[PDB]
Amino acid sequence: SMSVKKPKRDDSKDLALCSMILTEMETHEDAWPFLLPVNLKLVPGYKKVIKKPMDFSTIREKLSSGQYPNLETFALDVRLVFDNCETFNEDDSDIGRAGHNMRKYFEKKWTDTFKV
C-alpha cells in the first residue's frame, strides 16, 4: 500500500529474455502456421470467429517498439496465438498439433527462464 513497498524482482533483463524466447519460437520447425498474420481475405471464418488475431511477427513488432509494458503482457500475446489456434483447428490437424507443440515449447522456456 501507500509507502509500503513490496520487494520486486529485477526486471531489467526482461526485454532481452523475451526476445530470445521469441527467437526460439520463430525458428522452431513447427512455427510456420504462426509466423505471419492469418490472411483474413483467404481463410474462411477466421475474421468473424477469431476476435483478437495474433502471430509471431506482430509480437516481434510490439516487442521491438515498446508496446509490452511488462513480461506478463508479452506472455498473454504468446498464449493468445495458441488459444486462437485451438479455437479454429482440430487437435490432430497439422496446424492444430503444431499449436499444441508450440504451447508446450513456450511454457517450458517461460518457467525455465523466469521461474528462477
Ligand X SMILES: Cn1cc(C(=O)NCC2(N)CCCCC2)ccc1=O
Q: Count the site residues for ligand X by CB under 6 A.
A: 8
Name the minimum Å distance from CB 88 to ligand X: 4
The helix or strand, by DSSP H or E, that contains position 98, with its residue range, turns out to be helix 94-114
Binding mask 72-111 for ligand X (x = CB under 6 A): -------------x--xx-----x----------------
**Residues 6 or more apart in contact with residue 13 via CB below 8 angstroms:** none
Positions in 30-69 near ligand X (CB under 6 A): 33-34, 38, 43
Name the minimum Å distance from CB 20 to ligand X: 23
Q: Which is nearer to ligand X, 33 or 68 (CB)?
A: 33
27-30 LR contacts (CB < 8 Å, sep 24+): 28/102, 28/105, 30/97, 30/98, 30/101, 30/102, 30/105
Looking up cell 476476435 gives 51
Name the minimum Å distance from CB 115 to ligand X: 28
Helix ranges restricted to H, 11-90: 14-27, 46-49, 56-64, 71-88
Question: Site residues (CB under 6 A) for ligand X?
Answer: 33-34, 38, 43, 85, 88-89, 95
